[PDB]
Amino acid sequence: VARSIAADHKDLIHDVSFDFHGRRMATCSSDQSVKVWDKSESGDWHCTASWKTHSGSVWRVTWAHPEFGQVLASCSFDRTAAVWEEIVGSHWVKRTTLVDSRTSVTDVKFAPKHMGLMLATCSADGIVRIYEAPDVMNLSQWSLQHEISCKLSCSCISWNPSSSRAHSPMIAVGSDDSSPNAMAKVQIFEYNENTRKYAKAETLMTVTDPVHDIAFAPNLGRSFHILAIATKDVRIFTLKPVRGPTKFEIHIVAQFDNHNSQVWRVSWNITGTVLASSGDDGCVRLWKANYMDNWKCTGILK
């Protein structure tokens, strides 16, 4: 089917993010506002709150785990970011502001539960930053723990949602520069317990077109990693651990050009067996793999 919701946004919608329990939704716009929608028994979605956030365009908005309350985050274009919490009820108030950035901020994404309450923000100067909150009941104190330099204009970031104790935390960073030269565009970082510093793990030398979106796949028992890359085409990679930074066996298991245009966004499902892609034509395609480890399309939606 196909529903319809009038967002009443004065400008373009730039991001949509569901909550942990699948009952609320948050949107961001270029009109410098963020709205929250809650569903009822009748199935309709109603705009509960709508407030101005920043001074410029807002790019992305993400959610936080419900165990820490009802907390949001928003990277916008005034070189800052904000963390809003609304246990205060029934409006949303600002608990902090991350000012340390010097260029336009592109993406903000939280971290899994098992590593606390952490935030990772990327900038247009090639710098990604990792924050932390020491006491989880005081969201007005954050610290700048780590700092990375990527030598490329960052455009998208993605974590690794694996919960096993045998996988170290990772973070992948993508670039969007369109220089005539041919250099890698996706770089993978890993965290080493002894050195307590993030170090470069591997790079994808086969990727030279600009990358616009990156997303991992929820593990739920698998022993290897699956990565999705949005480019002129749609590519899927597989990283297998081998028996300093850990080495992996990198393979490519998909190169699909059915959109015949640029791919903007990607996303996975809860279990990690279906992927969704968006193109310039305005159509969404879903992909799934059989027992051959061959990925076949399942549905075209418009």
Partner: protein, 103 residues
């Protein structure tokens, strides 16, 4: 009459039944016969054969619909392990019936 020294037995040979049209019956009756003669591992194997060959596990004609029962670890691997076990005792009797029912 050195017959107890050989893996094969005459009475089992007389009492066994093999019917193509119905498979569950020609395994339950054989399980009863194996219990009657005195051997128990045959009873367990025949019970596993009853469970593992039902018409409910019929393979589909397309590869993007379901994972075939052959690659479930209780499918081809179980048969291979049982065949390997019974190829050591040189019990050709059980080998023939097993390799025919699963056909």
């Amino acid at each position: 009459d050195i017959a107890c020294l050989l893996p094969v037995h005459k009475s089992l040979g007389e009492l066994y039944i093999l019917n193509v049209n119905d498979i569950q019956e020609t395994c339950q009756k054989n399980a009863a016969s194996a219990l009657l003669v005195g051997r128990k591992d045959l009873v367990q194997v025949w019970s596993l054969a009853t469970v593992a060959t039902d018409l409910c596990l019929g393979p589909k004609s397309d590869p993007d619909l379901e994972t075939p029962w052959a690659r479930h670890p209780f499918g081809r691997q179980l048969l291979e392990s049982l065949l390997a076990h019974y190829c050591r005792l040189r019990d050709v009797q059980t080998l023939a019936m097993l390799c025919s029912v699963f056909e």
